[PDB]
């Protein structure tokens with residue numbers, strides 16, 4: 001494969017879709033390959049105070065995201081993570097702000113926004129020193145374990161694990177801090193992937209920059225239960241940010257996901273073809289955080 005660069009350079013699209021009437025934003029994207037198409041779920045917010053979730057109809061190419069039907073979910077699954085859990089031939093949708101810290105549901109047809117099972121507990125722990133509590137889960141498995149990573153809007157990244165044979169189920173109520181920094185440097189939206197062709201995992205984490213602009217920092221590990229090493233960890237030399245995105249429609253490069261080689265729990269990405277589906281917003285936007293007009297965009301790594 002292709003080693004991660006020490007300096008990332010991207011090109012970007014503009015906004016790839018506008019929210020369906022009634023929503024002010026589309027956020028926190030999760031995306032899988034599904035029958036040769038892209039299947040995307042997202043957080044929504046309306047014009048008042050309501051968070052929700054949605055999926056898009058599957059679409060073939062990124063120009064079709066703008067016209068793909070946007071399907072409200074009748075059960076809100078904010079900041080979702082979608083994947084196929086191969087060992088039990090079942091799809092899993094993990095999320096937050098349900099009945100415990102994190103939740104999940106299952107389905108045999110992930111294109112159906114309303115086909116998910118009743119809510120199941122994914123994590124029932126609490127964390128110290130956090131205004132939000134646990135936020136922005138992500139999940140990944142290797143040959144023997146499933147792993148849960150999450151943030152706390154507090155400078156820490158947390159990890160829990162279970163034997164893969166016990167999944168789907170709850171990770172319990174305890175977690176291990178695997179990294180800590182200032183609140184702004186390890187803020188939220190972690191995503192963890194296996195790099196195809198390398199004995200290496202990639203973690204990206206959203207950070208808040210010096211003028212409030214959102215960007216991503218990257219870290220690597222050789223084992224999911226091992227230590228993380230800074231890979232691109234400043235605003236001027238980020239994994240992805242205003243410094244290197246090639247995007248003018250947005251300064252923020254915020255909560256999203258890399259395009260994967262598989263839908264399943266191995267969370268594999270091709271380091272020769274990194275692409276980031278992120279949320280961005282017009283630099284002229286402002287006002288209360290919850291009403292910010294986020295939209296999807298796509299970065300393609302230059303090589």
Ligand SMILES: OC[C@@H]1O[C@@H](O)[C@H](O)[C@H]1O
Pocket residue numbers: 027028043078079135136188189255
């Ligand atoms: O979009 C809802 C939440 O806002 C942000 O703080 C999070 O990354 C996400 O969990």
Ligand SMILES: [Ca+2]
Pocket residue numbers: 028029030079080081136137138189190191255256
């Ligand atoms: Ca996420």
